[PDB]
């Protein structure tokens, strides 16, 4: 069942990296492939177009799709996929340049694809990878958000933000502009080690002409490691990151349909992105923000969920709906709880 039936593609295009899934008409994953970054705010639409085609074609060959056979549809769940202009252009260019790629296209957000992987009934996603974003889709389809503004205007509680906070705390400390809350020794040495430079002036080229958000944000690993090994400053930065992520939830709480709080699980919060691997370092800060953030109202508990498949699966489902097809989904298999908290 490869050549007789429609094939539905999804691309998850948030953060360090993209992933394609190809799925059969009946919901069976036929192929997966990794791809490069597809954030148009950072790389422009032209490179996005090239990268999407290249990675989808690798997946097509894995699946054994015959040459020059288009996908039925392709759901692109991309960072910045809500921008009207960028979306129009991405699709025009894909069609013009690569006419055998797919018969139809849907452009949507990374966050939409994530929610759609886990539920058809509305939910909350909280992304923390190289960037951060909090998005709600209510059962009625009304939407709300906090954050998602990128490194130039937010990304609080992301790997970029953790990395930036560490470097900034070190710079200000050494400048005598502001005293660090804890000793900077471990973080300063880790900075010189990670960037392979001997001083602050050497760091600058990695902020300016040689800047790459993935390369800079990767410093967050050294902060996670320091925290794991008990460095006060590193623990503090992760606690503050946890707090910022919690504040994103607190921000959107007033717009959440009360039905979403009901049930044994309480409010489910879908947690997407690499920073959640360090949950234990975020936990104290996260709970401080939630307990401190929630007003006589709403919720007795919440449960943090993670995806068991790529958000590209949700993107495939959305892409199929876009042309009238219900892609079969096993929502129970697609996500699982990793933490639950009851306030009392």
Q: Would you list which residues are annotated within the binding site?
A: 16, 39, 110, 130, 132-133, 148-150, 155, 217, 274, 278
Question: Are 9 and 59 within 8 A, CB to CB?
Answer: yes
44 interface partner picked from ligand NAG, a second copy, none, CB below 5 to 8 A per type = a second copy
Residue placing its CB nearer to a second copy in the complex, 19 or 155? 155
Cβ neighbours of residue 122 closer than 8 Å, sequence gap 6 or more: 115, 136, 137, 138, 139, 140, 141, 257, 260
Residue placing its CB nearer to a second copy in the complex, 32 or 156? 156
Q: How many whole angstroms separate alpha carbon 257 and alpha carbon 151?
A: 30
Over the window 145 to 174, marking each residue x when it contacts a second copy by CB under 8 A and - when it does not, the resulting string is: xxx-xx-xxx-x----------xx--xx--
Single residue of 113, 150, 268, 285 touching ligand NAG by CB under 6 A: 150
Q: What share of the chain is helix, strand, coil (3-state, %, to 5)?
A: 45, 20, 35
- The distance in angstroms from the start CA to the end CA of the chain is 52
Residues in the chain: 344
Q: What are the helix (H) ranges across 101-205?
A: 110-118, 159-175, 185-195, 200-203
Residue placing its CB nearer to a second copy in the complex, 164 or 239? 164
Single residue of 204, 259, 265, 326 touching a second copy by CB under 8 A: 204
21 strand-pairing partners: 10, 32
Q: Which residues would be at the binding site for ligand NAG (CB under 6 A)?
A: 14-15, 39, 41, 79-80, 110-111, 127, 129, 131-133, 148-150, 155, 204
Q: Which residues would be at the binding site for a second copy (CB under 8 A)?
A: 40-42, 44, 80, 82-83, 145-147, 149-150, 152-154, 156, 167-168, 171-172, 175-178, 200-201, 203-205, 207-209, 211, 247-248, 250-252, 254
């Amino acid at each position: 069942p490869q050549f007789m039936a429609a094939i539905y593609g999804g691309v998850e295009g948030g953060g360090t990296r993209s992933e394609v899934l190809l799925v059969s008409e009946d919901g069976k994953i036929l192929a997966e492939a990794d791809g490069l970054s597809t954030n148009h705010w950072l790389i422009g639409t032209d490179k996005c177009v090239e990268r999407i085609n290249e990675m989808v074609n690798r997946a097509k060959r894995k699946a054994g799709v015959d040459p020059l056979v288009p996908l039925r549809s392709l759901g692109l769940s991309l960072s910045g996929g809500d921008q009207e202009d960028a979306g129009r252009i991405l699709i025009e260019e894909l069609r013009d340049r690569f006419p055998y790629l797919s018969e139809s296209y849907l452009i949507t957000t990374d966050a939409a694809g994530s929610i759609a992987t886990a539920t058809p009934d509305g939910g909350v996603v909280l992304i923390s990878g190289t960037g951060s974003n909090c998005r709600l889709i209510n059962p009625d389809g009304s939407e709300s958000g906090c954050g998602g503004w990128g490194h130039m205007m937010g990304d609080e509680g992301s790997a970029y933000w953790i990395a930036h906070q560490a470097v900034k705390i070190v710079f200000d400390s050494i400048d005598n502009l502001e005293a660090a809350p804890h000793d900077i020794g471990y973080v300063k040495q880790a900075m010189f080690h990670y960037f392979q430079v001997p001083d602050r002036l050497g760091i600058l080229t990695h902020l300016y002409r040689d800047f790459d958000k993935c390369r800079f944000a990767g410093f967050c690993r050294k902060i996670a490691e320091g925290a794991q090994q008990g460095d006060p400053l590193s623990r503090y930065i992760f606690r503050k990151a946890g707090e910022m992520l919690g504040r994103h939830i607190v921000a959107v709480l007033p717009e959440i349909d009360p039905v979403l709080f009901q049930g044994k699980i309480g409010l489910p919060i879908l947690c997407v992105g690499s920073v959640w691997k360090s949950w234990e370092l975020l936990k104290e800060g996260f709970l401080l923000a939630l307990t401190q953030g929630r007003a006589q109202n709403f919720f007795s508990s919440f449960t943090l969920m993670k995806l068991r498949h790529s958000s590209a699966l949700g993107g495939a489902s959305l892409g199929a709906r876009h042309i009238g097809h219900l892609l079969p989904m096993d929502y129970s298999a697609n996500a699982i709880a990793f933490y639950s908290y009851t306030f009392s």
